[PDB]
Amino acid sequence: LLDSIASNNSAKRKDLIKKSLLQLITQSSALEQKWLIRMIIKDLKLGVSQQTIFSVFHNDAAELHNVTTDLEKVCRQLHDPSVGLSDISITLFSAFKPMLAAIADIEHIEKDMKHQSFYIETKLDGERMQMHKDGDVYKYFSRNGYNYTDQF
């Protein structure tokens, strides 16, 4: 039902969205409808961190989610708790969580660089993107893993 509603919103159709929501309402209880509303809004407020959920799911799941950024692969590969992954590293056509930068104090900057020469670069204002190229197959991914390939 959620897939139908999302695709149908993407297709510029509202009568079908109304039908799907009506079916969900008619075939749900008050608590189920409340939870469904929370998932639609994309907030649950469970009080438990996503990192905790991933850790309980498998020993090495946060790293795999960072490298891949797709709940399907993490859920599929990490099924048997005993069986782990030998080596996890960036792979083609799979979004990876970008590496960010933290505030720095000009006074102790040299100390933060272990008293060694460093690189100074200009700050760029705009979107953060990553490009995957294999032959003439191109994929573009945004900061959080959304696919912007259609635009570019």
Ligand X SMILES: Nc1ncnc2c1ncn2[C@@H]1O[C@H](COP(=O)(O)O)[C@@H](O)[C@H]1O
Q: Which is nearer to DNA, 31 or 100 (CB)?
A: 100
* Contact flags string 109-148 toward ligand X, x per CB under 6 A: ------------x-xxx--x--------------------
Q: Which is nearer to ligand X, 34 or 128 (CB)?
A: 128
Per-position DSSP letters for 47-103, written without gaps between them: SS-HHHHHHHH-SS-HHHHHHH--HHHHHHHS-SSS---S-----TTS--PPP----
Query: Out of 18, 34, 123, 139, which one is annotated catalytic?
Result: 123
Q: Applying CB under 7 A, what is the total number of residues that bind DNA?
A: 2
The C-alpha atoms of residue 142 and residue 98 are separated, in whole angstroms, by 9
Cβ 40 to ligand X, closest distance in Å? 29
Interface residue with ligand X, options 41, 100, 120, 137 (CB under 6 A): 100
The C-alpha atoms of residue 19 and residue 127 are separated, in whole angstroms, by 37
Catalytic residue flag (residue 123): yes
Q: Kindly state whether residue 100 participates in binding DNA, applying the rule CB under 7 A.
A: yes
Cβ 102 to ligand X, closest distance in Å? 8
- Torsional class of 130: left (φ above 0), alpha (ψ -120 to 50), beta (otherwise): beta
Q: Are 142 and 148 in contact (CB under 8 A)?
A: yes
Q: Kindly state whether residue 104 participates in binding ligand X, applying the rule CB under 6 A.
A: no
Q: Are 95 and 103 in contact (CB under 8 A)?
A: no
Per the structure block, which two tokens stand in for 121?
């670069």
Report the catalytic residues.
123
Residues that bind DNA (CB under 7 A): 100, 128
